[PDB]
Design an enzyme around this catalytic site. Sequence first.
Site, short mmCIF file in Angstrom:
data_model
loop_
_atom_site.label_atom_id
_atom_site.label_comp_id
_atom_site.label_asym_id
_atom_site.label_seq_id
_atom_site.Cartn_x
_atom_site.Cartn_y
_atom_site.Cartn_z
N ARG B 151 1.00 -0.92 0.13
CA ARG B 151 -0.31 -0.57 -0.11
C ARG B 151 1.42 1.19 0.15
O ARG B 151 0.50 2.67 -0.63
CB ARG B 151 -0.89 0.11 1.21
CG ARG B 151 -2.15 -1.32 1.11
CD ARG B 151 -2.80 -0.64 0.32
NE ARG B 151 -4.38 -1.29 0.30
CZ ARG B 151 -4.54 -2.62 -0.02
NH1 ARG B 151 -3.31 -3.37 -1.96
NH2 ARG B 151 -5.62 -3.23 -0.21
N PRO B 328 -5.61 -18.87 -19.96
CA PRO B 328 -6.87 -19.66 -21.19
C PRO B 328 -7.72 -19.21 -21.43
O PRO B 328 -8.44 -17.77 -20.87
CB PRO B 328 -7.82 -20.30 -19.55
CG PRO B 328 -6.64 -20.16 -17.98
CD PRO B 328 -5.91 -19.49 -19.24
N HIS B 356 -15.04 -24.97 -18.87
CA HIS B 356 -15.42 -23.63 -19.34
C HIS B 356 -14.95 -22.91 -20.37
O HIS B 356 -15.53 -22.39 -20.83
CB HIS B 356 -14.58 -22.70 -17.48
CG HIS B 356 -14.03 -21.21 -17.56
ND1 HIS B 356 -15.68 -20.58 -16.96
CD2 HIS B 356 -13.56 -19.88 -18.12
CE1 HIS B 356 -15.61 -19.04 -16.62
NE2 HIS B 356 -14.30 -19.35 -17.75
N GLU B 357 -13.42 -23.41 -21.34
CA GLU B 357 -13.32 -22.70 -22.46
C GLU B 357 -14.60 -23.20 -23.74
O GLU B 357 -14.70 -22.72 -24.12
CB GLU B 357 -11.53 -22.71 -22.23
CG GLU B 357 -10.80 -21.86 -21.55
CD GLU B 357 -11.60 -20.87 -20.96
OE1 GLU B 357 -11.55 -20.21 -22.27
OE2 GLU B 357 -11.49 -19.99 -19.86
N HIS B 360 -17.30 -21.62 -23.60
CA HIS B 360 -17.34 -20.28 -23.95
C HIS B 360 -17.43 -20.42 -25.46
O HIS B 360 -18.32 -19.63 -26.32
CB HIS B 360 -15.99 -19.36 -23.77
CG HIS B 360 -15.95 -19.01 -22.34
ND1 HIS B 360 -16.67 -18.02 -21.85
CD2 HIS B 360 -15.32 -18.38 -21.19
CE1 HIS B 360 -16.89 -18.01 -20.68
NE2 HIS B 360 -15.40 -18.07 -20.27
N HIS B 487 -8.71 -4.23 -10.86
CA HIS B 487 -10.01 -3.99 -11.77
C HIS B 487 -10.33 -1.79 -12.51
O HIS B 487 -10.84 -1.35 -12.71
CB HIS B 487 -11.22 -4.12 -11.56
CG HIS B 487 -11.36 -5.33 -11.91
ND1 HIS B 487 -11.57 -6.34 -12.73
CD2 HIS B 487 -10.26 -6.57 -10.63
CE1 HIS B 487 -11.24 -8.02 -12.81
NE2 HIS B 487 -10.34 -8.10 -10.72
#
Lengths: 247, 596
Positions: B151, B328, B356-357, B360, B487
């Site tokens: 930080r 991935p 998962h892929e 997709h 983000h």
Amino acid sequence: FASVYAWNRKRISNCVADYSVLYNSASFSTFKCYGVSPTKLNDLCFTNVYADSFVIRGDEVRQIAPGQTGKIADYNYKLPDDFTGCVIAWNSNNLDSKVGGNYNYRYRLFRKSNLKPFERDISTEIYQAGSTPCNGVQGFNCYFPLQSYGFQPTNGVGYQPYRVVVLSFELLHAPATVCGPKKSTNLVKNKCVNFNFNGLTGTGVLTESNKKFLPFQQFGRDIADTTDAVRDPQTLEILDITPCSFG
Amino acid sequence: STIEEQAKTFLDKFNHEAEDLFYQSSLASWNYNTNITEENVQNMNNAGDKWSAFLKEQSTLAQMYPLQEIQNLTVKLQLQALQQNGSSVLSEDKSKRLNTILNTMSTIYSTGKVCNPDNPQECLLLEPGLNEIMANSLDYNERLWAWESWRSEVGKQLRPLYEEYVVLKNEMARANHYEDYGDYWRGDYEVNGVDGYDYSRGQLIEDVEHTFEEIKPLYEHLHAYVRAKLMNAYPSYISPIGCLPAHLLGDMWGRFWTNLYSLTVPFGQKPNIDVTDAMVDQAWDAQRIFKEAEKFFVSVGLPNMTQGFWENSMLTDPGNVQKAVCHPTAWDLGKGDFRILMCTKVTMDDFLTAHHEMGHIQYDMAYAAQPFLLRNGANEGFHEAVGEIMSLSAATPKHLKSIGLLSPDFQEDNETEINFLLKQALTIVGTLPFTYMLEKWRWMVFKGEIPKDQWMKKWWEMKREIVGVVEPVPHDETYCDPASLFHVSNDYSFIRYYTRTLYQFQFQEALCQAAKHEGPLHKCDISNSTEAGQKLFNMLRLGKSEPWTLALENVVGAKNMNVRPLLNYFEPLFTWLKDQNKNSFVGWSTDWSPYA
Ligand SMILES: *[C@@H]1O[C@H](CO)[C@@H](O[C@@H]2O[C@H](CO)[C@@H](O)[C@H](O)[C@H]2NC(C)=O)[C@H](O)[C@H]1NC(C)=O
């Protein structure tokens, strides 16, 4: 092959077309037509067949259909709904695609009007998509009537180049001239049989004969169309016919 | 001529002239991300600069069209994205200032290094090392010092830069027909078309906490359980009235609570379902794993893959010096070319990641029939939710037994199923308060309710109040906590996963209900369920061609947000939580602090 907007049309006459190779070869991806039963091509005899060969995109084969809307069907090549023939479409990726991007075959995309059945228009004019003349200049609401194909080595089914040739069998007043042969069986002798010598039919028993046909006749008779001697259409020899015994 | 026909002709020209360009750009990006070479660098450079340069003129044409009378809702739908001003109405100074600010934030975020006071000649970065040491440490002092160092040597300088970026982006929104940058972010979950399927931009602000408040019992019970574990753990650090600290969250920010599994074990002796050793005993190759996943996908009812994916794309163990980054991903290259990018390995986590892929991939091929402009989903929540549906569906024991991996005599009892449910909830429902408060902070800073001085005090106050995380040491105004995040410093929306969790749980419950399955949802397997596959096919194939509320009509019959599937999945876990900590009281006190 040719482009879809400039498909290569050829008139074909006086050729003994064996459609058996067309009927059996698996090289043709598409053999889907309705004009003629695929097994009766050899028997049915026509005149001045039209073979129109071209290269299109993979997805455009369904565009070639009577009474069907599309892009190349209504702007490049329109089929009348009374088609008497067939369409042959096969994948030719390795034949008309390039690793660096193939763009040789163009296709009409924008047209001011529709297309007549079996009409070919090679017009290369600017398209007025708005309310102002384009003057051959790509201004506002001014686009190009033709676009390019995107053949790529990694393109799957639907984008690879498809070679399509359409055969139209027209039967107009002129005598039919294009069709395949008829299978000739082995010849037998000295047995009561029936025969179809070169279109001349008859039942009887055949023997070797010594009559000397003058070099242009086909078959001889004695009285009132009672054929007695014939010449085989293959070996050029003279045989004679006598009726099977009865009483 | 009418304007609609002109717009349609413009679309017919533009999609055709942009498909090839975006295909080339995708080819270059995939080539570099698979065949890493110096040539591929300028390959992406010269294949991606042309995309923006051509889209410049593509947007330039899309101003003469009066986008206020085009009908049928189809041309307008694409042209709205085509007629997007964005950052094209600026002068050079403000635009270059924004670019420099983003560049400096990215450089500072990517240069993170911490050295101790004694030896400043060996720093550690955000890559494994410091991160792994602190997140899985054993003593308090190193965690506290690492938190302070990160930080104090990353986010200290970013206060004025973040302020300038926020005000510049707010001015961007104001000059681009929006009151806030948060308004622009919320514009994704909004349609202004068909009556009865509309969602307003301000609706989401209330709806987020509306759907978040119902997990408050489950969240508070899990928090009290973790607090009881902490009190039973290293003492003199946790109080019965306070809550868990900031540096003991299992992560830098407490974003994901997967690593807190060992410290809060209910049973511990009973292990989860993990027969990776059975796979390696069977000596399965990665193609066998992919084939089994494909068989599951076909059993569901999703359409078959086309040839070329399994050939052109790398599959396993690149090997020699020709390395390949294997983040991935399911690459949608288009024009009859679709690939995957993965370091596929024989492990259950890798098995679920492959599922998962492939999910997709299935979603990407679902809307493939759409033209170039609409080869994406209606909202950002559908993509990853579809990806994670088949990750959640491949974890049930029945599928592992059916693919010949689990023991035929492996019976399921309460203990292991409850442990699996608890570990799934540890990561799934353990992040929603943090996500909600972070999105709230971003909305407030973009709106401007709180002043420049009351930024981090408010952040920590609502962390103590809502999330329940306290101050290790006091920081008033010289530490910029949110800028120390991925983000926030990269300008990526975080509501995507917030809606993704709800979407994936709603779809899981929907397929389980319409899959002829009775019992717990954690054991629900969508394999060999043709009706569920038909529903998913009929829904996902639409893409962005329909509004998101109209999209939220096939898999689930509700177009509104419902948190009910989240509680439906973890019903036994909450029921056990209702009796485990029957002595300690749920909740926490904000006034309590480690130092105060
Ligand atoms: C029709 O084709 C057959 C096939 O070649 C010809 O038969 C050959 O004829 C030559 C010349 O007499 C012989 O030497 C060969 O032995 C024959 N081959 C056979 C019978 O298999 C035949 O001559 C041709 N006839 C016509 C009129 O074209």
